[PDB]
C-alpha positions in Angstrom: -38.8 -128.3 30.7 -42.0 -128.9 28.1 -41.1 -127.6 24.8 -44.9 -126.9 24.1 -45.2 -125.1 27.4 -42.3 -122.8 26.3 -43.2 -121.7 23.1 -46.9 -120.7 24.3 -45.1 -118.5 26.9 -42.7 -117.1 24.3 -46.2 -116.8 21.7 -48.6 -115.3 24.6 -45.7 -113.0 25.8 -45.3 -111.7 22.1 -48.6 -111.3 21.8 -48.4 -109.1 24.7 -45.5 -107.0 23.5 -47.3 -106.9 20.2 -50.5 -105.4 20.8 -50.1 -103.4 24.2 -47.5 -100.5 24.9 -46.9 -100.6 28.9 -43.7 -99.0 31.0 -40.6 -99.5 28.8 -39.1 -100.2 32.3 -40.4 -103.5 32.2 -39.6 -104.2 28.7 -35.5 -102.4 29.5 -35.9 -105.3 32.2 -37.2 -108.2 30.2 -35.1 -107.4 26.7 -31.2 -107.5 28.6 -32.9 -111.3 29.9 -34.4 -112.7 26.5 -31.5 -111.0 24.2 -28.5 -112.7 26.0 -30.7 -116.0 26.4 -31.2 -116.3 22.7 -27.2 -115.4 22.0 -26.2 -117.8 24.4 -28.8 -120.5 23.6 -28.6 -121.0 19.5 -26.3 -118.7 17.9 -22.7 -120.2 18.3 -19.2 -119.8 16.8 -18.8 -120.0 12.9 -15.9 -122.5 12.9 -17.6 -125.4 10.2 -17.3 -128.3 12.1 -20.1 -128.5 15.1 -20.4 -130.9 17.6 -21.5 -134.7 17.8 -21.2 -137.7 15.9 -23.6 -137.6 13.3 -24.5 -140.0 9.8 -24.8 -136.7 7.9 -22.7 -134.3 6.3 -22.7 -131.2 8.5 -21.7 -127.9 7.0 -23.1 -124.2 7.3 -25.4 -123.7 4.5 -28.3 -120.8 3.5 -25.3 -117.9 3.8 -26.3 -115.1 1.4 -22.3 -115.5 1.3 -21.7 -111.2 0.9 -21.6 -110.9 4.2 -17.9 -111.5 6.3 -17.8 -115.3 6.0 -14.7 -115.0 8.5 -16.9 -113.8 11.5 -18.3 -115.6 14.9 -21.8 -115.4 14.5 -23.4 -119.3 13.2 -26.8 -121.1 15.0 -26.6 -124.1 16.7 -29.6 -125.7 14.9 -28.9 -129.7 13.4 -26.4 -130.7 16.8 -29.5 -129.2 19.1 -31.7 -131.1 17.0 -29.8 -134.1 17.9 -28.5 -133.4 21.5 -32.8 -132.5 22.0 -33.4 -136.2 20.6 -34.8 -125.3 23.1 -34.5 -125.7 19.5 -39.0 -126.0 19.0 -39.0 -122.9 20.4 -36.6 -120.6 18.1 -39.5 -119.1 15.9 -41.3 -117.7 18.8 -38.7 -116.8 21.0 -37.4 -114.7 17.9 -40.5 -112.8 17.7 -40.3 -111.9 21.5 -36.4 -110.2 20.7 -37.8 -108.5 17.8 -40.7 -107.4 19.0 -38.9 -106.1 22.3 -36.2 -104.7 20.3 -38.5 -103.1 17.7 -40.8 -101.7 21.0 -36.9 -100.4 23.0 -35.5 -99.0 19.8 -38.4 -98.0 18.0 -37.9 -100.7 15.3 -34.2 -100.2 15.2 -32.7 -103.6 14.2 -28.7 -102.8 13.7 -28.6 -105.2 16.8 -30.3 -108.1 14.7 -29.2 -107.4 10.4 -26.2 -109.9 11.1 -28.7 -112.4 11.8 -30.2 -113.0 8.6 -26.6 -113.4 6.7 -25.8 -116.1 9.1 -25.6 -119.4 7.7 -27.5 -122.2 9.5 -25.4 -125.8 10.5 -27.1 -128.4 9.0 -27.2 -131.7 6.5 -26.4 -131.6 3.2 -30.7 -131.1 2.5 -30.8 -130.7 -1.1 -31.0 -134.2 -2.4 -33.7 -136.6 -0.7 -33.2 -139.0 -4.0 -29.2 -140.8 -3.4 -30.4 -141.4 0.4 -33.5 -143.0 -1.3 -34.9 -146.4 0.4 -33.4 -146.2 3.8 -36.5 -144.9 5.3 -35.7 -144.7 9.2 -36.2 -142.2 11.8 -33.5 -139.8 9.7 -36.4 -139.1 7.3 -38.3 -137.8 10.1 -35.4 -135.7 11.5 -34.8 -134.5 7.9 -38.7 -133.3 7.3 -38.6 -131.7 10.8 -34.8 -129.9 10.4 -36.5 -128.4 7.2 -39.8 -127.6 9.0 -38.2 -125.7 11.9 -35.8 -124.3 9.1 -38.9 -122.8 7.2 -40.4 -121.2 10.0 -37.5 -119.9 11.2 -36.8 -118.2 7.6 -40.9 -117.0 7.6 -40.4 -115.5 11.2 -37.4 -113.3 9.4 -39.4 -112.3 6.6 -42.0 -111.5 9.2 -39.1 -109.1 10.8 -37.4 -107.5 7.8 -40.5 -107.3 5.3 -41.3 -103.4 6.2 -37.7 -102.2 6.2 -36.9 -100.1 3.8 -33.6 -100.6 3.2 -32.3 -101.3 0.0 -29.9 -104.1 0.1 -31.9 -105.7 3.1 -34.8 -106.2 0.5 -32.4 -107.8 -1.9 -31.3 -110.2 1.5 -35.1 -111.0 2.0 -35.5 -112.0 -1.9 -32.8 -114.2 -1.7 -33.9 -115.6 2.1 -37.6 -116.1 -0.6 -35.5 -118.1 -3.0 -34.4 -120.1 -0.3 -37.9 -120.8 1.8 -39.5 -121.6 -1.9 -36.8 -124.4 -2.6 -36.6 -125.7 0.8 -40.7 -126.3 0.1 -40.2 -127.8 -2.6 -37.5 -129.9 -0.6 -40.2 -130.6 2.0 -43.1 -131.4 0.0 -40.6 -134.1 -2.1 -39.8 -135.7 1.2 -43.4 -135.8 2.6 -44.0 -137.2 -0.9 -41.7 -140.2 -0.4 -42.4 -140.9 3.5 -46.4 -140.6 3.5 -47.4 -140.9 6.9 -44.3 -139.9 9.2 -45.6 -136.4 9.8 -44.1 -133.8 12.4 -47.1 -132.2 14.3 -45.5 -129.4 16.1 -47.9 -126.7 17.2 -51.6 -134.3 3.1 -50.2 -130.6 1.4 -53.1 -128.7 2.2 -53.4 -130.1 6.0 -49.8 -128.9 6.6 -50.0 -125.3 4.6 -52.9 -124.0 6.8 -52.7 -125.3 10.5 -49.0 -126.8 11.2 -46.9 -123.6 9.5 -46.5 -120.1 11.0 -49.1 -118.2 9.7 -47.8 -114.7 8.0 -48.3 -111.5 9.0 -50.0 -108.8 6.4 -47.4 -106.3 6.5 -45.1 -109.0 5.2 -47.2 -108.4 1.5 -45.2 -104.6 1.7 -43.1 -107.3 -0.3 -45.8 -107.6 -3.4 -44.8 -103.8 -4.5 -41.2 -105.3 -5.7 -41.8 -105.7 -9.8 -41.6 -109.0 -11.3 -38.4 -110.6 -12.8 -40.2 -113.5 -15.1 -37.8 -116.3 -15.8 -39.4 -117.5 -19.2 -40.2 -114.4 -21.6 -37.0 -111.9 -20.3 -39.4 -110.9 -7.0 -39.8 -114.1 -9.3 -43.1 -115.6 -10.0 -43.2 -119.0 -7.4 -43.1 -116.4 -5.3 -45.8 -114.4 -6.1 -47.4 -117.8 -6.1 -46.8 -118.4 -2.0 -47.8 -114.5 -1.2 -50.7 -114.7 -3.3 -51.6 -118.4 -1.9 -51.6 -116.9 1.3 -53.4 -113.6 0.9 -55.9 -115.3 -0.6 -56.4 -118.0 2.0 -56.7 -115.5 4.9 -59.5 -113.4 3.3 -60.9 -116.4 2.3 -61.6 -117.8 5.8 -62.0 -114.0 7.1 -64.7 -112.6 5.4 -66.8 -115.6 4.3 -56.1 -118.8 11.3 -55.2 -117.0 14.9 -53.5 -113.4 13.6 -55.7 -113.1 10.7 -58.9 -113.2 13.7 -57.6 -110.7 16.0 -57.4 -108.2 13.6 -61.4 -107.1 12.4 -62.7 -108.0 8.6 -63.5 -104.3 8.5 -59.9 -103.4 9.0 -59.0 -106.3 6.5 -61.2 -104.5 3.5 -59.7 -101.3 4.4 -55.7 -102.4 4.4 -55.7 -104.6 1.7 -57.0 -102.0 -0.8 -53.9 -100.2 0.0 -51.8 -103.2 -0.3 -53.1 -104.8 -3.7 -54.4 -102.7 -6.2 -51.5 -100.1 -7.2 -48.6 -102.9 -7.0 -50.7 -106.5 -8.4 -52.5 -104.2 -11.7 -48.8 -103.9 -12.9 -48.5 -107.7 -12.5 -52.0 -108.1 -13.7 -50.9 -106.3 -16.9 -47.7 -108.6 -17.3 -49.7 -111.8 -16.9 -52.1 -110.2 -20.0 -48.5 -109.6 -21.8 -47.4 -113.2 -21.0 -50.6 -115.3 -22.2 -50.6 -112.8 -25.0 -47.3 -114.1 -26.1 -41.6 -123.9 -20.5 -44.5 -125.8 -19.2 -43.7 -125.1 -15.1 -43.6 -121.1 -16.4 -46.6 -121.1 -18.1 -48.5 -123.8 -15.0 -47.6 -121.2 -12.0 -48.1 -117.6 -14.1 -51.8 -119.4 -14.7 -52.4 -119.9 -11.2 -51.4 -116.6 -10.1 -53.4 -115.0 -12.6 -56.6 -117.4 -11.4 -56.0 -116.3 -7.4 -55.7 -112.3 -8.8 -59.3 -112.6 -10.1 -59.9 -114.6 -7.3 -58.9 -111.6 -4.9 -60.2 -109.0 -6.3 -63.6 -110.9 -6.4 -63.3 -112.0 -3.0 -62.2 -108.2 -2.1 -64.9 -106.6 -4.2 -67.7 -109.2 -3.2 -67.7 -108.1 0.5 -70.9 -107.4 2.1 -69.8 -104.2 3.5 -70.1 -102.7 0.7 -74.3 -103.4 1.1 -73.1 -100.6 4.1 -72.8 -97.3 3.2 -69.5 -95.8 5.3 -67.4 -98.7 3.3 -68.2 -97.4 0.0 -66.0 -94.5 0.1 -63.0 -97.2 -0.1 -65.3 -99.0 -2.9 -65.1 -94.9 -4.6 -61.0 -95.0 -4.2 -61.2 -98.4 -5.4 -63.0 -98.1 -8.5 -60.7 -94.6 -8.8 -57.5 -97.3 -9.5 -59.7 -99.8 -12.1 -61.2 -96.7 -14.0 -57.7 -95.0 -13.6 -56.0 -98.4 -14.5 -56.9 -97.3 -18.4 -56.5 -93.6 -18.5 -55.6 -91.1 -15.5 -57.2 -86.9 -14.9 -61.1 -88.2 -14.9 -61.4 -86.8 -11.4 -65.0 -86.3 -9.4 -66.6 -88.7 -11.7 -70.0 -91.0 -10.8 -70.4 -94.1 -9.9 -71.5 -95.6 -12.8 -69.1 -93.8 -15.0 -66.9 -95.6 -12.7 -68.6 -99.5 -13.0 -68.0 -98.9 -16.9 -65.1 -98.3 -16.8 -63.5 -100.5 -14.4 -65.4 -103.6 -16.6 -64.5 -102.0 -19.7 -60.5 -102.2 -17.9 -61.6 -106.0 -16.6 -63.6 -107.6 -19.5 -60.4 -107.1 -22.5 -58.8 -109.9 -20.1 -61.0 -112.7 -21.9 -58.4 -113.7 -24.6 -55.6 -114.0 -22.1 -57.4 -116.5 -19.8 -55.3 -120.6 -19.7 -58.1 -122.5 -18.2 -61.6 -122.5 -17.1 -61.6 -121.4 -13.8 -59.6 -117.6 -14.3 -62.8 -117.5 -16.6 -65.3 -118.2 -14.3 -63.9 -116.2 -11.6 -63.3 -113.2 -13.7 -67.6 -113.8 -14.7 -68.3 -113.7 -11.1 -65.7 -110.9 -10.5 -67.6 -108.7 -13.6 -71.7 -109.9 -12.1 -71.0 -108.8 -8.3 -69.5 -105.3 -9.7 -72.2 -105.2 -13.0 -75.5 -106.0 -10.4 -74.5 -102.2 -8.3 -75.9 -100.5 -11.2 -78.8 -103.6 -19.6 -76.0 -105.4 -18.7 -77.7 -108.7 -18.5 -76.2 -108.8 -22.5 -72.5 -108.6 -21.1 -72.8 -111.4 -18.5 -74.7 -113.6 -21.2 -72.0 -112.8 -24.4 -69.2 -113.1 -22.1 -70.4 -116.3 -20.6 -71.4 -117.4 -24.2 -67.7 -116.4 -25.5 -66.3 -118.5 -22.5 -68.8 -121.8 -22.6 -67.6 -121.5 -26.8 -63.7 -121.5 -26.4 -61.6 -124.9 -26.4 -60.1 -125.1 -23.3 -57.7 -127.7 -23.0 -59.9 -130.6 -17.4 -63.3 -128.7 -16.1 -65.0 -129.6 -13.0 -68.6 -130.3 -13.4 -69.9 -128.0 -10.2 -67.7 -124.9 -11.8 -69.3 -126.0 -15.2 -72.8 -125.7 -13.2 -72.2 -122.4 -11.6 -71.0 -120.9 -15.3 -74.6 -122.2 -17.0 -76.5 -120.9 -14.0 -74.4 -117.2 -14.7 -75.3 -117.5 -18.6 -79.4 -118.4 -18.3 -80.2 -116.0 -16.0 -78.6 -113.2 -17.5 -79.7 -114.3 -21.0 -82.9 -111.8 -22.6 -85.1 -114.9 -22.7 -84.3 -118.6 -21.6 -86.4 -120.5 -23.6 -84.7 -119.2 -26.4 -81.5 -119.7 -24.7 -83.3 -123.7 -23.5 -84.4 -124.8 -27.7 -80.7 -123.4 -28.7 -78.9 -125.6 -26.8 -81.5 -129.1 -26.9 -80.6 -128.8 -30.6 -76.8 -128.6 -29.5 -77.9 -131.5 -27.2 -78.8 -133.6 -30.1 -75.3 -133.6 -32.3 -73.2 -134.5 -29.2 -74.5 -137.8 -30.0 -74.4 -137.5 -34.0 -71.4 -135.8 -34.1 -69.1 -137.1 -30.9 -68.5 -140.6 -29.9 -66.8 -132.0 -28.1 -70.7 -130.9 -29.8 -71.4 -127.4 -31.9 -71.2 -125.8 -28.6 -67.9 -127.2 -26.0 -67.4 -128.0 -22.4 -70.4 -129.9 -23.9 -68.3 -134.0 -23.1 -70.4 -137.2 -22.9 -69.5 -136.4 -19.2 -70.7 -132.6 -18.9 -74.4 -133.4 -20.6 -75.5 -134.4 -16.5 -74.9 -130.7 -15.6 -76.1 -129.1 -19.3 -79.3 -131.3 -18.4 -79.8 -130.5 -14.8 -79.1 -126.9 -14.9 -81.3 -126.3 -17.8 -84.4 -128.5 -16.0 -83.7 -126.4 -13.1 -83.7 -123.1 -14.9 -86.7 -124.3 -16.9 -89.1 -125.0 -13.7 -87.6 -122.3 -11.8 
């Protein structure tokens, strides 16, 4: 009768079917039960018009349209929305059939592959702008129909991300394509109505929390190659995988699936599952910035979360514990081997040299300041295992010097505390830049020296003081 009662069954119950393997009996029991509920509950017949009176266009949209289009098999999902004002529960209770299915059948899904060329019955979603000032109750119906929509595609992807199927791939991509525009769809009409939000079990707040969080084996998706619309797996996409990813380790190893699983087993998959797939992507983002605007905004912002990662995966403190660092060895045998391959049994240093000598020829490809300063902090935490003091302080130098067209003054801080400490002396490093100090005032109503604004001097002075005394 509760709809939040339901799905916690249907989410506890999948949990169970998940993580422990008991009798199949049971599970032969339970699976004939949940299989013809679902089939009976939301999927209907495809004939277009659906049931109800309703002051919206209804049609069956989100069909990758090769598929039969003259078959039976439609879902239910705007007239339930209606007739419920079941249909909160359809993400979980679609894990609970795969996951019996996949457990029965031993991940056998010829049952469930006409599922995801279904199209789904609802509005006509794509423009929130002609119905613009009328803003009722529909708004909030609209924003929830995409919600649930949106989970219900991430709950596929969860499903069909490991299978290896060719052309079921391609159906995933374009089931991507989809989820991407729909969120852009989404984040348009929160935009316009700014306080009717769904809670069902302001950007940031719903990304986290409110969503489905992903699974990990879901990123067996990041080893498709990259069709890049400007320069000729797209890259807004990369942008949502990488968003994620990132966000998960993040939280971890400084959000309920991410927890269950240990940080130690998190190190150890994700070096699989990033290094020999995102260093070809790596190398097209050098190729790119080598070498309109929306392009160039999201391949910047991939490239910032990459260096991001791989400081983030690189900075654990496991690797203070020995029985890690084998991994770390493997690891550094991609970055070393990222420039030239047969250099096998070599040391560890040998292997620091070269993995920085791979990383630091990045510098001339980097947008904006904070790919920079990630990539610094990326090159210290590897460079401190080992001199190299000189290659913090001229890289920091090189990236304190460049233009850079703005900069926070707390990432501006953390760079100047990198550069004086690494620096051979700092009050040689102090009297250079208190007579750069000076001709921001002469010069600039910008200096001989920039990220040096009228603004910036606070931190310049602070950090400096603060270097000085310490």
């Amino acid at each position: 009768q509760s709809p939040q009662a339901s799905a916690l069954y249907y989410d506890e119950f999948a949990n169970l079917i998940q993580h422990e393997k008991l009798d199949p009996k049971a599970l032969e029991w339970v699976g004939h039960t949940i299989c013809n509920d679902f089939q009976d509950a939301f999927v209907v017949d495809s004939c277009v018009v659906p049931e109800g009176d309703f002051p919206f266009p209804v049609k069956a949209l989100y069909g990758l349209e090769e598929y039969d289009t003259q078959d039976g098999i439609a879902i239910n999902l705007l007239p339930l929305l209606f007739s419920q004002d079941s249909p909160l529960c359809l993400a979980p209770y679609f894990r609970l059939l795969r996951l019996c299915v996949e457990r029965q059948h031993n991940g056998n899904l010829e049952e469930i592959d006409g599922l995801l060329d279904c199209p789904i019955f609802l509005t006509d979603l794509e423009p929130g702008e002609k119905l613009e000032s009328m803003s009722a109750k529909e708004r909030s119906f609209m924003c929830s129909l995409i919600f649930l929509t949106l989970n219900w595609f991430r709950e596929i992807v969860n499903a069909f991300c490991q299978e290896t199927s060719p052309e079921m791939k391609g159906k995933v991509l374009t089931r991507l394509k989809h989820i991407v525009e729909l969120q852009i769809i989404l984040e348009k009409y929160l935009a316009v109505t700014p306080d009717y939000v769904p809670p069902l079990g302001l950007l940031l707040h719903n990304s986290h929390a409110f969503f489905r969080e992903l699974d990990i084996e879901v990123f067996s998706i990041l080893h498709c190659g990259l069709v890049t619309k400007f320069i000729l797996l797209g890259p807004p996409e990369l942008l949502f995988l990488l968003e994620d990813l990132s966000q998960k380790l993040e939280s971890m190893l400084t959000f309920s699936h991410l927890q269950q699983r240990s940080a130690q087993e998190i190190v150890h998959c994700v070096f699989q599952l990033l290094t020999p797939m995102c260093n070809h992507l790596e190398n097209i983002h050098n190729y790119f910035q080598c070498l309109k605007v929306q392009e160039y905004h999201i391949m910047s912002s991939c490239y910032q979360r990459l260096l991001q990662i791989f400081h983030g995966l690189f900075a654990w403190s496991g690797f203070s514990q020995p029985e890690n660092q084998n991994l770390l060895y493997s690891a550094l045998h991609v970055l070393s081997s990222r420039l030239k391959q047969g250099e096998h049994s070599q040391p560890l240093e040998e292997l620091l040299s070269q993995s920085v000598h791979y990383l630091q020829n990045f510098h001339q490809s980097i947008p904006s300041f904070q790919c920079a300063l990630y990539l610094i902090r990326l090159l210290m935490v590897i460079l401190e295992k080992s001199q190299n003091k000189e290659k913090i302080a001229s890289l920091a130098r090189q990236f304190l010097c460049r233009v850079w067209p703005n900069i926070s003054n707390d990432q501006l801080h953390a760079l100047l505390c990198i550069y004086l400490e690494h620096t051979e002396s700092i009050l040689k490093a102090i009297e250079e830049i208190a007579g750069v100090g000076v001709p921001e005032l002469i010069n600039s109503p910008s200096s001989t020296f920039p990220t040096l604004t009228r603004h910036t001097f606070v931190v310049f002075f602070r950090v400096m003081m603060a270097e000085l005394e310490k």
